Design an enzyme around this catalytic site. Structure first.
Site, mmCIF file in Angstrom:
data_model
loop_
_atom_site.group_PDB
_atom_site.id
_atom_site.type_symbol
_atom_site.label_atom_id
_atom_site.label_comp_id
_atom_site.label_asym_id
_atom_site.label_seq_id
_atom_site.Cartn_x
_atom_site.Cartn_y
_atom_site.Cartn_z
ATOM 1 N N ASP D 61 0.834 -1.192 0.000
ATOM 2 C CA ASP D 61 0.000 0.000 0.000
ATOM 3 C C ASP D 61 0.873 1.247 0.000
ATOM 4 O OD1 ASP D 61 -3.093 0.337 0.327
ATOM 5 O OD2 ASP D 61 -2.245 1.934 1.566
ATOM 6 N N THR D 94 -3.763 5.023 -3.699
ATOM 7 C CA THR D 94 -2.778 5.773 -2.932
ATOM 8 C C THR D 94 -1.444 5.862 -3.657
ATOM 9 O OG1 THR D 94 -2.467 3.717 -1.713
ATOM 10 C CG2 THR D 94 -3.779 5.434 -0.681
ATOM 11 N N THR D 95 -1.108 4.860 -4.467
ATOM 12 C CA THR D 95 0.110 4.944 -5.263
ATOM 13 C C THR D 95 -0.092 5.819 -6.492
ATOM 14 O OG1 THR D 95 0.675 2.715 -4.513
ATOM 15 C CG2 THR D 95 1.918 3.607 -6.366
ATOM 16 N N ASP D 391 -8.488 -2.762 1.331
ATOM 17 C CA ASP D 391 -8.612 -2.065 0.052
ATOM 18 C C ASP D 391 -9.781 -2.614 -0.754
ATOM 19 O OD1 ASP D 391 -6.407 -0.636 0.822
ATOM 20 O OD2 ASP D 391 -5.226 -1.073 -0.972
HETATM 21 N N1 LIG Z 1 -5.191 -7.173 -14.076
HETATM 22 C C1 LIG Z 1 -4.711 -5.938 -14.355
HETATM 23 N N2 LIG Z 1 -4.254 -5.631 -15.586
HETATM 24 C C2 LIG Z 1 -3.776 -4.410 -15.874
HETATM 25 N N3 LIG Z 1 -3.711 -3.406 -14.984
HETATM 26 C C3 LIG Z 1 -4.136 -3.577 -13.713
HETATM 27 C C4 LIG Z 1 -4.672 -4.884 -13.319
HETATM 28 N N4 LIG Z 1 -5.015 -4.784 -12.025
HETATM 29 C C5 LIG Z 1 -4.725 -3.521 -11.623
HETATM 30 N N5 LIG Z 1 -4.199 -2.803 -12.629
HETATM 31 C C6 LIG Z 1 -3.767 -1.388 -12.557
HETATM 32 O O1 LIG Z 1 -3.036 -1.132 -11.360
HETATM 33 C C7 LIG Z 1 -3.269 0.215 -10.950
HETATM 34 C C8 LIG Z 1 -3.339 0.316 -9.437
HETATM 35 O O2 LIG Z 1 -2.531 -0.692 -8.844
HETATM 36 P P1 LIG Z 1 -2.668 -1.074 -7.287
HETATM 37 O O3 LIG Z 1 -1.290 -1.132 -6.678
HETATM 38 O O4 LIG Z 1 -3.577 -2.273 -7.202
HETATM 39 O O5 LIG Z 1 -3.479 0.137 -6.599
HETATM 40 P P2 LIG Z 1 -2.854 1.597 -6.352
HETATM 41 O O6 LIG Z 1 -1.467 1.499 -6.926
HETATM 42 O O7 LIG Z 1 -3.755 2.505 -7.146
HETATM 43 O O8 LIG Z 1 -2.916 1.770 -4.854
HETATM 44 C C9 LIG Z 1 -4.585 0.645 -11.569
HETATM 45 O O9 LIG Z 1 -4.398 1.855 -12.302
HETATM 46 C C10 LIG Z 1 -4.973 -0.467 -12.516
HETATM 47 O O10 LIG Z 1 -5.238 0.076 -13.807
#
Ligand SMILES: Nc1ncnc2c1ncn2[C@@H]1O[C@H](COP(=O)(O)OP(=O)(O)O)[C@@H](O)[C@H]1O
Ligand SMILES: Nc1ncnc2c1ncn2[C@@H]1O[C@H](COP(=O)(O)OP(=O)(O)O)[C@@H](O)[C@H]1O
Ligand SMILES: Nc1ncnc2c1ncn2[C@@H]1O[C@H](COP(=O)(O)OP(=O)(O)O)[C@@H](O)[C@H]1O
Ligand SMILES: [Mg+2]
Ligand SMILES: [Mg+2]
Ligand SMILES: [Mg+2]
Ligand SMILES: [Mg+2]
Lengths: 260, 52, 205, 528, 532, 48
Positions: D61, D94-95, D391
């Protein structure tokens, strides 16, 4: 880093290796006959393949440069007042002797210079001497008066390379200094590297020797050193081709073939 | 520098095996002129296999 | 309680990194102690005479230089002292002055150093504090005047406690003559400057 | 500068101003974004941070990593603040917020360095963000069918997308189904405290279970507890807030007697008070007795004699969860234990899970709560599983609020970038460069995905740009196939709220950082 | 594992650190670029103050630690040595190239492709400059030299007084002109002796039609002014004769001691009499002169100067036609001094310059030389005037040797950026990004000029780029190539008409050197720093 | 008060300024200006 300048450096290395060995009946290459000289300034595109030799030493006889049809002479004795190997002193007990000592020293120096000039020499290389003065100001003035370019402080270990390149034979006593020991050259001039120093280039030699010199230029010292290392690697590759004349494809092919 | 022998001899490694590899690269430089990085990589890979 | 033949064996070669890290600081200290004992313990723990020429020497010293008087350079740290003593050509003499602010006789000898530096460009007069060098308490309490001399990296003079032989209100000429008694001091005014490739000139050719 | 005998501010005051101060702020924001750059995407990697006490926290996270980092740069702390804000409002992204904000700042750094007035940049960001939010709201896909099956599927897909970046991505379908099932039983407030998350060491991830009821650890059983039966088939639960012990009647109570008969009467009276409370509890018909206050050994043995079950010192939150599940009322007085204040569960059982004893309340048809029992091999393992489930739970709750979704994988950012570039090509030119920089900065997400996956970012970005230009709103990075694909048909779905809030917070942070021109640091007080 | 006693940085960290160091060096000197640039004051923790605007001087005085920054410092030094101008532009361009190349690398573009693209872009930029943007000075005349000197002297302490300083510079350079073999006019700058002396205003700086010495007569007896000077240049001292190390005097008969002691000075007496018997009036020697020889010169009404610098003596001998005599030895073993070894000058005067005296040799025969005496307000002002004057002299020498100049004010680089961004699409698939980044980096100099002028850099550069794009697209607008920047009015201006010129060699060498430095730094991806 | 113990009574600008030691380089420049004026013409030292 010189992959961009390879188009210039690779033929230079090939020519350097070919001009130093006999194409037939050769089993090894002595890379010590290919002298690499590094001069700061310019770019890597300014590298040269001087056929003769380049000397970092400056011309002591300031005022004379670019001797044409030079008859180069290399000496190993000193042009100064007489001085025996054993301890020597001159005792003066009269003013007449005190004038005659200066008169005779001047006469001796003038005789040495005239003997050197009579041989037809016009470029003189003087070996470095740390015991006695190798080139007195009187001797330099006399040589300048007779229009002979003087180059002193030649390193002791560089004599063999110079003799192999030009063809001069070292002379350690004025008695044996003759025109038979001179090395004819087409031109002996001191070039200017656009304000980044002066190089003394002797290009064109009757009966050229089996030596070549490479001048390496660059913007800063680090790229100059790396270019020198790369050129040395190319020369070593061509040498390893001279002995054991066998070629294989690169690109990872031999190792993967070995693995399989 | 990109030369393997120069890189190895310029930095102090302080380990006997690493020092022998440095000497090996120097020997390859002396004999074969170039290829001083491939020889070290090959020796390291061979010893890595020797572990297993 | 056996195994006197320990033969640590593999231990060192896996830890010589930290050993050499400690040894580097140890050597940096060790050069400091080696250089800071060359005056300690050995002497630290322990009517032609009217000289009418000295007066005119003083007046001509008063008119020494026009641009500025300049100040004696101050050493800030032991490492700076080390790397300015070690550097510089060995053919020139460097003398170092140790003092602590508060003791009498310090400003007078500082002014003498200023005058001599003004009239001796070759010399590189410099001063240090007794507290920054971390000398012994005996040095700080009873050896305030200390004029060390560095000619090529070795002493040719170790004048300590010069108050008795110089007084407390000595001037530049007195210190100059006292130093010249043992031959310590080696023997025009431009507009501002003259200094401005190597190509000089040529004609026709 | 001059000594100024009486200086203006306190000595040691550090003031930095001008363009270099803003450039340093932008560089600090870049450094902060670098900390969580590799945690984004299904190919993201965890980070391990050790605090001063030696405790290690392992998390993917972004908000957690930024919190553990002790950021003291005044400008860089804005990124941590907006990460916290995104976590609070949405729970995911959050990222993304930090990357977007730092990339905005990086894109406008060249214009800042050449003397552009920051107000122009701020206005450009405001306009671009408003347009992007409007476009997201316009192009987000929602269906007005309001059927349970498709809503359930949408929630499951959103949960899988939220979970497909953590260490539990291999079991993302299992956990997504569990999370959606857990959320669907919350009634109307969707309170996080109504979903308990228990972590029990030992056991595979697939061994984790969702309890349609309430479960909590055994709480310091006294002597005689082991005689109580540990399974009931239709128990009535007496939820109490009562200290069932032999104790002083009141803290200020004081008994004065002058006869041995009265002494014996007082002793028997205390015993009779305790037995009267126990008798009322027993005659209430309950078979399981839970109390927030301690239950003594005498009461434990009394309940063991009656084939009853007791558990004192139950945590207050666990009692609230049990009340919500079984459907009773927490009674502070045992005088009126009517039939409507007793919880009802189908099966109560005490079982051992990984070396710990847990009380289970299953078979509650009218349950309005859950309990996650997470099985893992390490403390940080279960902690990060809990973070991932949090999440997913927040994503499912937000999707329940509104079923407006957009395709992830960089598709939405690519479409927004194309739209913003097309808009910026129709303005005089001072704002055109800045809006184009904003559109280029929006490309960080697919680029970061490709960089984390080991792809070639430039080729994928070129293909995505060419595709979006020629049509296709939902084309994004396809990690498994090393190519691009329609992410909407690949079921990479995230709610539009996530991207809306990410863009808004990133723009606000960028504008706040750009607006600042001078930083003043007063000398510390009580340095110790 | 490595067990190397040192610190190792690998990957993005070392590249970012190198670019940080280069950017720090660039930002050190970015504020001293162009006419709206301002000087800097340097203090060396002793009290010495150096007010300067030259980039090479600023970077030389600073003590630098990071090797990537030292690379840029030596780059500036090399640009100064080989050209003499643009020592700030080369550093700025190199740092911008490095920064954009690092950005490309961070975009997962391999550094080899970036280096190849940079090489191609530099080659094409040089070709385009030499093909289109050069202006032949043959049809311009002396006004071109005046304008080039004025342009080079902007951003300096003597910028406003350019109308007179440029005339002085051009006059001096033309005065020291000489020809060599192959008929190539060679202009040997550093033969103009620059003398500094505080005092009157800069408008009182004198251009001596001869040579200026920083020396005075050896004794007050000699006259301070000789009309028909016969200069005798000597390379040997005139002192009492001391016998060599290998000769010692041993006396067995006392009667010879007086004769020996007398001849010990009679030798120098005879040498001086030989020198003076030929009519020599002024005697300059590199060695010293003691009291008796000074008296000998006094009695003859001559002028003797001792401790003359070797380079000054060589220049005076070359200008006056004298031959430097290391000794009075001929080819017959005698002691002679022929009259042919005497230089000639129209006058030799010891003038007073601000409570100090220097010797002026006026209107030498057989060759014309030049010297400049700079009058300022203090030492720092005179030093800065000397540095700016040297820059102007080098620029004029470059213009006179190579007869091509290019418009200034950033016109050349805006045109280069337009042409390179147009040409990038026709080369490669990934090196085209490198070419485009080279083109974008070339715009750092006009941006810096506009920023220094406190003008709208974005709008001004956009207008300049639009003008140059219209010039390159429209075949009938080839006259718009000269549109540069007018820093006073903050608007584009045709600099060729306005007279803002600079040698082509400056831009060519700066581009080549900056490209090589950026390529050299770009290859580093691993740093091992062994502990001392 | 001279650093070597002397006493200087004067109202000459250059005589006063030459005895002041300063750290700010601008003050050094001003002192050099005073010395320049004194050496060039010998008067008007406070005026400049
Ligand atoms: N199966 C997938 N294929 C392609 N992109 C993905 C997939 N799952 C998540 N993402 C991408 O990962 C990004 C966010 O990654 P994550 O680390 O899960 O949450 P965040 O980084 O936003 O806290 C999103 O922009 C999403 O488009
Ligand atoms: N009068 C002028 N108008 C517009 N531009 C000018 C003018 N004079 C100089 N410039 C430009 O300013 C730039 C900076 O020159 P400068 O920094 O003084 O030289 P250096 O780089 O050697 O210090 C040059 O490239 C030149 O083209
Ligand atoms: N009798 C006078 N009445 C008015 N002004 C005077 C008189 N005498 C001198 N001055 C002024 O005093 C100034 C001289 O001051 P001085 O102490 O010499 O300082 P400085 O050496 O800098 O000139 C001159 O400018 C002059 O005009
Ligand atoms: Mg190789
Ligand atoms: Mg997520
Ligand atoms: Mg310039
Ligand atoms: Mg007055």
């Amino acid at each position: 880093v010189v992959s961009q300048y390879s188009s210039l450096l690779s033929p230079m290395s090939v020519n350097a290796v070919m001009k130093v060995i006999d194409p037939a009946t050769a089993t090894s290459v002595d890379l010590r006959d290919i002298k690499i000289v590094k001069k700061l300034g310019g770019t890597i595109d300014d590298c040269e393949l001087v056929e003769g030799l380049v000397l970092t030493q400056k011309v002591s006889n300031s005022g004379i440069t670019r001797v044409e049809k030079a008859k180069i002479g290399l000496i190993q004795f000193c042009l100064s007042a007489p001085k025996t190997d054993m301890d020597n002193q001159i005792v003066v007990s009269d003013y007449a002797q005190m004038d005659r000592v200066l008169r005779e020293e001047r006469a001796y120096i003038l005789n040495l210079v005239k003997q050197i000039k009579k041989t037809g020499c016009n470029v003189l290389l003087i070996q470095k001497s740390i015991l006695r003065d190798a080139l007195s100001d009187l001797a330099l003035h006399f040589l300048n008066k007779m229009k002979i370019m003087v180059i002193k402080d030649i390193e002791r270990e560089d004599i063999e390379f110079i003799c192999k390149t030009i063809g001069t034979k070292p002379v350690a006593h004025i008695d044996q200094f003759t025109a038979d020991m001179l090395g004819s050259a087409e031109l002996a001039e001191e070039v200017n590297l656009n304000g980044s120093g002066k190089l003394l280039k002797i290009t064109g030699c009757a009966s050229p020797g089996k030596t070549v010199t490479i001048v390496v230029r660059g913007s800063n010292k680090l790229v100059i050193e790396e270019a020198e290392r790369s050129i040395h690697d190319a020369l070593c590759v061509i040498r390893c081709l001279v002995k054991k004349r066998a070629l294989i494809a690169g690109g990872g092919a031999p190792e993967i073939e070995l693995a399989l | 520098t990109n030369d393997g022998a120069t890189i190895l001899k310029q930095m102090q490694v302080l380990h006997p095996a690493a020092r022998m590899l440095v000497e090996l690269s120097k020997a390859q430089d002396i004999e074969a002129g170039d290829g001083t990085t491939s020889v070290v990589i090959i020796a390291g890979s061979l010893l890595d296999s020797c572990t297993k | 309680l056996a195994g006197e033949g320990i033969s640590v064996n593999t231990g060192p070669k896996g830890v010589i990194n930290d050993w050499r890290r400690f040894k580097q600081l140890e050597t940096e200290q060790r050069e400091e102690q080696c250089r800071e004992m060359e005056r300690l313990i050995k002497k630290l723990s322990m009517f032609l005479q009217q000289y009418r020429k000295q007066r005119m020497e003083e007046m001509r010293q008063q008119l020494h230089k026009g641009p500025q008087f300049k100040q004696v350079f101050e050493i800030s740290s032991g490492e700076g002292f080390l790397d300015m003593i070690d550097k510089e050509q060995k053919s020139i003499v460097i003398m170092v002055h140790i003092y602590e602010d508060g003791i009498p006789g310090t400003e007078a000898m500082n002014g003498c150093m200023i005058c001599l530096a003004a009239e001796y460009p070759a010399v590189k007069f410099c001063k240090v504090k007794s507290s920054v060098i971390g000398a012994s308490s005996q040095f700080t309490r009873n050896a305030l005047p200390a004029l060390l001399i560095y000619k090529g990296g070795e002493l040719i003079g170790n004048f300590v406690r010069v108050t008795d032989q110089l007084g407390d209100d000595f001037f530049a000429v007195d210190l100059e003559a006292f130093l010249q008694e043992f031959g310590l001091l080696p023997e025009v005014l431009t507009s501002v400057r003259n200094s401005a490739s190597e190509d000089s000139d040529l004609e026709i050719d | 500068m001059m000594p100024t005998p009486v200086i203006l501010l306190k000595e040691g005051t550090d003031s930095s101003q001008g363009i270099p101060q803003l450039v340093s702020n932008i560089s600090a924001c870049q450094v902060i974004a670098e900390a969580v750059r590799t945690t984004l995407g299904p190919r993201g990697m965890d980070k391990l941070i050790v605090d001063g006490r030696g405790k290690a926290t392992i998390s993917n996270d972004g908000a957690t990593i930024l919190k553990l980092l002790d950021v003291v740069h005044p400008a860089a702390k804005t990124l941590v603040d907006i990460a916290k804000s995104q976590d609070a409002e949405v729970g995911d992204g959050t990222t993304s917020v930090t990357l977007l904000a730092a990339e905005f700042l990086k894109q406008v750094k060249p214009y800042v360095e050449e003397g552009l007035h920051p107000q122009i940049i701020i206005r450009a960001f405001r306009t671009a963000t408003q347009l992007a939010v409007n476009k997201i709201k316009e192009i987000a896909v929602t269906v007005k069918k309001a059927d349970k099956v498709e809503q359930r599927k949408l929630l499951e897909k959103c949960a899988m997308t939220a979970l497909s970046s953590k260490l539990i991505s291999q079991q993302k379908a299992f956990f997504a189904k569990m999370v959606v099932d857990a959320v669907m039983m919350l009634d109307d407030l969707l309170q996080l405290k109504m979903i308990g998350i228990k972590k029990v060491q030992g056991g595979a991830l697939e061994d984790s279970q969702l309890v349609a009821g309430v479960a909590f650890k055994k709480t310091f059983s006294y002597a005689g507890f082991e005689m109580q039966p540990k399974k009931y088939h239709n128990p009535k639960i007496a939820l109490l807030n009562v200290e069932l012990e032999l104790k002083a009647e009141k803290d200020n109570a004081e008994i004065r007697v002058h006869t041995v008969e009265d002494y014996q009467a007082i002793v028997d009276a205390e015993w009779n008070i305790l037995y009267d409370k126990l008798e009322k509890i027993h005659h209430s018909g309950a078979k399981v007795v839970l109390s927030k206050l301690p239950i003594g050994d005498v009461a434990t043995q009394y309940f063991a004699d009656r084939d009853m079950f007791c558990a004192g010192r139950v945590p207050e939150e666990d009692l609230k969860r049990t009340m919500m599940a079984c459907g009773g009322s927490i009674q502070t007085s045992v005088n009126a234990l009517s039939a409507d204040v007793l919880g009802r569960c189908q099966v109560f059982e005490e079982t051992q899970i990984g070396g710990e004893r847990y009380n289970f309340f299953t078979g509650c048809p009218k349950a309005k709560t859950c309990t996650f029992i997470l099985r893992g091999g390490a403390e940080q393992f279960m902690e990060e599983t809990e973070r991932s489930l949090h999440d997913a739970i927040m994503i499912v709750r937000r999707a329940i609020k509104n079923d407006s979704v957009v395709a992830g994988g960089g598709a939405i950012e690519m479409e927004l970038s194309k739209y913003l570039r097309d808009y910026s090509r129709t303005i005089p030119g001072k704002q055109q460069l800045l809006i184009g920089a904003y559109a280029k900065a929006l490309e960080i997400i697919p680029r970061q995905l490709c960089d984390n996956a080991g792809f070639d970012a430039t080729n994928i970005l070129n293909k995505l740009r060419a595709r979006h230009a020629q049509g296709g709103t939902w084309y994004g990075v396809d990690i498994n196939n090393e190519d691009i694909a329609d992410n909407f048909e690949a079921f990479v779905w995230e709610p539009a709220m996530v991207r809306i809030n990410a863009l808004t917070a990133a723009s606000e942070a960028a504008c706040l950082i750009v607006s600042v021109d001078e930083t003043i640091k007063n000398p510390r007080s009580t340095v110790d | 594992p490595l067990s190397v006693f040192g610190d190792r940085s690998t990957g993005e960290t070392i590249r970012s650190q190198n670019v940080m160091a280069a950017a720090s060096i660039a930002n050190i000197v970015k504020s001293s670029l162009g006419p709206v640039g301002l000087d800097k004051m340097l203090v060396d923790d002793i009290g010495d103050v150096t007010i300067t605007n030259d980039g090479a001087t600023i970077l030389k005085l600073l003590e630098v630690e990071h090797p990537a920054a030292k690379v840029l410092c030596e780059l500036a030094d090399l640009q100064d040595k080989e050209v003499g101008d643009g020592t700030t532009s080369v550093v700025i361009i190199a740092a911008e190239l490095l920064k954009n190349a690092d950005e490309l690398v961070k975009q997962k573009i391999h550094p080899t492709s970036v280096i190849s693209g940079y090489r191609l872009a530099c080659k094409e930029a040089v070709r385009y400059i030499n093909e289109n943007l050069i202006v032949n000075t043959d049809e311009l005349g002396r006004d071109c030299l005046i304008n080039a000197a004025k342009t080079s002297m902007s951003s300096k302490i003597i910028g406003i007084n350019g109308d007179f300083f440029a005339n002085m510079v051009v006059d001096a350079v033309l005065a020291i002109k000489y020809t060599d073999i192959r008929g190539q006019p060679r202009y040997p700058v550093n033969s103009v002796n620059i003398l500094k002396a505080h005092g009157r205003s800069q408008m009182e700086s004198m251009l001596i039609s001869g040579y200026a010495l920083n020396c005075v007569v050896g004794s007050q007896g000699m006259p301070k002014r000789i009309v028909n000077a016969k200069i005798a240049c000597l390379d040997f001292s005139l002192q009492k004769t001391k016998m060599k190390l290998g000769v010692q005097v041993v006396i067995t008969d006392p009667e010879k001691l007086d004769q020996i002691r007398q001849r010990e000075s009679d030798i120098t007496k005879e040498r001086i009499q030989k020198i003076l018997a030929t009519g020599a009036n002024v005697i300059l020697t590199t060695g010293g002169i003691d009291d008796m020889c000074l008296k000998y010169f006094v009695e003859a009404g001559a002028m003797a100067v001792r401790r003359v610098l070797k380079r000054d003596l060589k220049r005076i001998a070359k200008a006056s036609g004298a031959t430097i005599l290391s000794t009075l030895a001929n080819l017959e073993g005698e002691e002679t001094f022929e009259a042919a070894m005497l230089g000639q000058a129209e006058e030799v005067v010891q003038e007073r310059i601000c409570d100090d005296e220097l010797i002026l040799i006026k209107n030498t025969k057989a060759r014309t030389s030049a010297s400049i005496i700079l009058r300022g307000a203090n030492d720092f002002m005179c030093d800065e005037m000397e540095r700016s004057l040297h820059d102007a002299l080098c620029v004029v020498k470059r213009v006179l040797e190579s007869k091509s100049v290019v418009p200034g004010g950033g016109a050349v680089e805006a045109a280069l950026s337009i042409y390179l961004e147009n040409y990038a699409t026709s080369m490669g698939s990934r090196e085209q990004l490198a070419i485009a980044e080279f083109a974008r980096s070339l715009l750092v100099i006009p941006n810096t000029l506009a920023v220094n002028a406190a003008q709208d850099s974005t709008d001004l550069v956009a207008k300049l780029r639009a003008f140059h794009n219209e010039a390159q697209v429209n075949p009938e607008r080839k006259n718009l190539k000269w549109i540069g920047l007018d820093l006073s009015n903050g608007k584009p201006r045709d600099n060729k008409q306005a007279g803002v010129f600079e040698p082509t060699i400056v831009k060519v060498k700066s581009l080549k050197f900056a490209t090589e430095a950026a390529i050299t730094i770009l290859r580093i991806d691993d740093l091992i720093k062994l502990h001392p | 008060l001279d650093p070597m113990g002397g006493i200087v009574m004067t109202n000459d600008g250059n005589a006063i300024l030459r005895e002041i030691q300063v750290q700010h380089p601008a003050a050094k420049s001003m002192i050099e200006i005073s010395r320049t004026q004194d050496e060039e013409v010998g008067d008007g030292t406070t005026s400049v």
